[PDB]
Design a protein around this ligand. Structure first.
Ligand SMILES: COC(=O)N[C@H](C(=O)N[C@@H](Cc1ccccc1)[C@@H](O)CN(Cc1ccc(-c2ccccn2)cc1)NC(=O)[C@@H](NC(=O)OC)C(C)(C)C)C(C)(C)C
Lengths: 99, 99
């Protein structure tokens, strides 16, 4: 589909078979989800945004669907105010910017 | 153009006669540039992202040419880690997400 940018490009994602709303973010290197009690091993990571860095848990090879398109990759979990789909997953679903 | 996302979507912009590199950022409500001089009266404001809030200077009705496409809109200036073109200007240049 095509998504205009008049409002925040929020779309439905599925992780662990459950649904969330997330921002399709071309300014994000990584995918960062709001605190959730995801199972499995993880590694500590620090990621930086406009106001500084936060601590996240890095989970690898996690299946996700984004607007019905399947993807699999690294998902960071931490105290973000918004679920963010970053370029690591946007490439997998064939997402481009166009003007 | 059509821009894929295996790299950061940086483009050349012209603003106040000067050339800069900036990130086409669908996850940004606002356009935020690194500390610089711009003509006109600015209003103090605060914006937040991951890592928290920063203080910026809000300049209104500022022309920027973004990858050959003209826009005139609100530009925030402050200690952002990267020059960011947000949705306020992406809409002006007719930018959309597609997959
Ligand atoms: C409603 O608030 C906003 O729209 N906030 C925007 C904002 O922060 N957007 C974030 C997503 C977001 C939205 C709302 C609340 C919280 C977060 C991103 O679209 C843009 N941002 C812009 C940005 C991009 C890079 C960097 C950076 C950090 C350290 C070193 C180099 N670059 C900082 C900010 N990117 C990042 O922060 C990403 N960082 C990143 O990719 O780092 C490599 C994350 C996400 C992976 C953490 C602005 C402050 C830019 C206007």
């Amino acid at each position: 589909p095509q998504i205009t940018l008049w409002k925040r490009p929020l779309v439905t994602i599925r992780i662990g078979g459950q649904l969330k709303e997330a921002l399709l973010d071309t300014g994000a290197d990584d995918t960062v989800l709001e605190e959730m009690n995801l199972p499995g091993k993880w590694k500590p990571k620090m990621i930086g945004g406009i106001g500084g860095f936060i601590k996240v848990r890095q989970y690898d090879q996690i299946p996700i669907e984004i607007c019905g398109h399947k993807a699999i990759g690294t998902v960071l979990v931490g105290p973000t105010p918004v679920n963010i789909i970053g370029r690591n997953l946007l490439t997998q679903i064939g997402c481009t910017l166009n003007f």
